[PDB]
Q: What sequence folds into this?
């Protein structure tokens, strides 16, 4: 749930790849 969390969004602005994991 990276796309849902602002941490992964602000941390990975280039591409929401973390979303793949969660």
A:
């Amino acid at each position: 749930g990276c796309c849902s969390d602002p941490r992964c969004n602000y941390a990975h602005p280039a591409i929401c790849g973390g979303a793949a994991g969660g």
Helices lie at 6-11. Residues 6-11 form the longest helix (6 residues). The CA atoms of residues 12 and 18 lie 8 Å apart.
